[PDB]
Design an enzyme around this catalytic site. Structure first.
Site, short mmCIF file in Angstrom:
data_model
loop_
_atom_site.label_atom_id
_atom_site.label_comp_id
_atom_site.label_asym_id
_atom_site.label_seq_id
_atom_site.Cartn_x
_atom_site.Cartn_y
_atom_site.Cartn_z
N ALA B 159 0.45 -0.25 -6.71
CA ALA B 159 -0.53 0.72 -6.81
C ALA B 159 -0.52 1.60 -5.59
CB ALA B 159 -1.96 -0.02 -6.91
N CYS B 160 -1.67 1.82 -4.83
CA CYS B 160 -1.79 2.90 -3.80
C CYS B 160 -0.92 2.68 -2.73
CB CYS B 160 -3.28 2.67 -3.20
SG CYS B 160 -4.47 2.61 -4.46
#
Lengths: 375, 375
Positions: B159-160
């Site tokens: 993800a991030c």
């Protein structure tokens, strides 16, 4: 001072096998009832020429096409119900361990127990498999937390070759010294993305989880030296599944057959067999191994007919079953995990110093080779 | 002779920015019409106290919450339609380059042109981002093929933090000598997984793609030395999205709000800020860097209020605007790509020897630090 690249070993492996199986006979009984029901229900559309009638399957067709005789599944009832023809898996609360992480955790606990070292020693978790249950938080982080591990974790997906690409990645991580050990998990609920209504593929996928611990050789006791790895990808649409997050931006497509596994098997057979055979022989030569001298091959576990041909080309002779392991008869094709199941289940009888090959191949196209030596 | 770990550099980066923006004003106009229409349609339920009325959004609320003023989007019309409130993205043929791969390819070509070396030198492609358009064939392999690259490729998702985890992975690959250069792409269609009807998140996600080329320092001309990386994950459900391949096994859940981004934003703010601050400072100390001496920081690009606190903690004083780069005003939160956009767009007026920090943090939880030095 220079930091030297640390060689790596496969120190332990683990396996979780679901308790329920669907034999070819059970699969075919439900499929053929589905076919009859579908053709009758849609008889007017069929006679108008809007769609083709469906064709029945048979256990003899499946076994000839692939060598598969059975598969394990996480959720059996829907697969054997002609009115369902897929798993029924009610959702769990976010508070509970997810079904895919749970499988990974069970396989990892077996690997950790066999390994015998303190788990605080594991610095990375790689969840390497063909389909993550969700995009975020990562599966690997869920697994890391459930196992009580520190460090970092991430998910990686190259479908059928995820376990060999994961072993390579793990070997580079321990090689650079940033971690002392890496846990890889390969949880595969392939029944979740198979089209059980497709005669050409309904017998192909099954469910399992595998795990491996990779650590630097200078600390390992026993296990298997990683002599070398080679990874290759070459784009193909011959194995494809179009399901994913952007289907919400086109909900009218969400229920099309292309949102499940689609394989053009004749093309895969023609193209992947020489790709893999050539890669194995080239890699062996690069690292000074005589492929004819391999004690055992743990090839991908999807199609016995492909394994026969690849194995013959690698060894220069018809391989014995001992030396060209088959577990796809019981497990069917578990994508990333198959070659690891074969390795885990069929290695205890070998001698110190024997050479082996773990080799995966499939969607991408992808292929990976891992040459190993018994310590 | 011993095999030494080969240090790595970031040799080039690339950026693709979609042509269409949704300003806060445009976003709020659509959202507030959705709200007004909902309150009218549900008037009797609201007047009976069965539910609360929905509250309008505002540009002031968005800017206070985040610093975001606009976002780029790949497919605008549905996002500004109060009856649709999502992207509308028609499906492409398998014969066409996918939308997510196309964005990665455009960013990658920019990186390749800046790099100026033959693309035959790239041995691996990592597609590192928060959401893959397909499970297989991998996005990275599609990108590899479109760029005419050899070698191997795979998808990875934290993800991030996918871009910092990808830089670390690329550096270990280069370090071990198995490849001479790695291409990372971070294509993000975060508008595809945002809930545009959710007041507390409708303004958060935007779309972009970034790219970077990592190569061995021995052969690098200019660029940025990777002085060190550190990766950390710590499981949290405070940012989660439950959409995935098993949703077809429980269709009742398939359009529930938990199948898009769900964030408990105050918990994230309170927990992730100290996690990241402490990690940066400890990592700097480990590798002999005084963080008060950093020339520039390129932190994650989701919430200016988080960047202000972390930047001040790391630098030991209030950073100038040039010292703590902000691009989220224009791009909103692009998950993995944000810190790379900041780094790509703002590395002017820096001299050979200057120290910088690329740092991502978000869902997982995940965080990654990459300390760099201008060559």
């Amino acid at each position: 001072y220079f930091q030297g690249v640390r060689p790596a070993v496969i120190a332990a492996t683990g396996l979780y096998t679901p308790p329920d199986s669907v034999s070819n006979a059970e699969l075919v009984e439900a499929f053929n009832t589905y076919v009859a029901n579908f053709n009758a229900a849609n008889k007017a559309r069929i006679e108008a020429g809007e769609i083709e009638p469906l064709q029945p399957s048979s256990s003899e067709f499946i076994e000839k096409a692939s060598g598969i005789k059975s598969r394990y599944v996480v959720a059996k009832p829907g697969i054997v119900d002609p009115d369902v023809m897929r798993p029924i898996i009610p959702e769990r609360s976010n508070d509970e361990l997810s079904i895919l992480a749970e499988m990974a955790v069970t396989a990892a606990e077996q690997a950790i127990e066999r390994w015998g070292k303190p788990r605080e020693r594991i610095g990375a978790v790689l969840c390497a498999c063909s389909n993550m249950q969700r995009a975020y938080p990562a599966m690997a982080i869920e697994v890391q937390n459930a196992l009580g591990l520190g460090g970092f974790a991430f998910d990686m997906n190259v479908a059928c070759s995820s376990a060999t690409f994961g072993l390579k990645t793990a070997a580079d991580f321990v090689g650079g010294g940033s971690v002392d050990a890496v846990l890889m998990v390969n949880p595969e609920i392939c029944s979740g993305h198979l089209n059980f209504r497709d005669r050409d593929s309904h017998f192909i996928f099954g469910d399992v989880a595998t795990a491996a611990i990779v650590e630097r050789a200078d600390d390992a006791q026993g296990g298997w030296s990683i002599l070398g790895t080679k990874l290759k990808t070459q784009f193909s649409n011959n194995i494809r599944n179009n399901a994913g997050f952007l289907n919400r931006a086109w909900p009218e497509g969400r229920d099309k057959a292309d949102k499940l596994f689609v394989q053009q098997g004749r093309k895969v057979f023609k193209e992947v067999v020489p790709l893999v055979s050539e890669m194995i022989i080239e890699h062996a030569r690069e690292i000074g191994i005589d492929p004819h001298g391999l004690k055992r091959m743990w090839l991908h576990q999807a199609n016995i007919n492909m394994n026969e041909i690849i194995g013959r080309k690698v060894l220069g002779r018809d391989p014995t079953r001992d030396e060209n392991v088959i577990i796809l008869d019981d497990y069917a094709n578990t994508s990333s995990a198959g070659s690891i199941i074969a390795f885990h289940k069929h290695q205890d009888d070998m001698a110190q110093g024997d050479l082996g090959l773990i080799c995966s191949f499939g969607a991408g196209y992808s292929a990976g080779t891992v040459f190993v030596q018994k310590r």
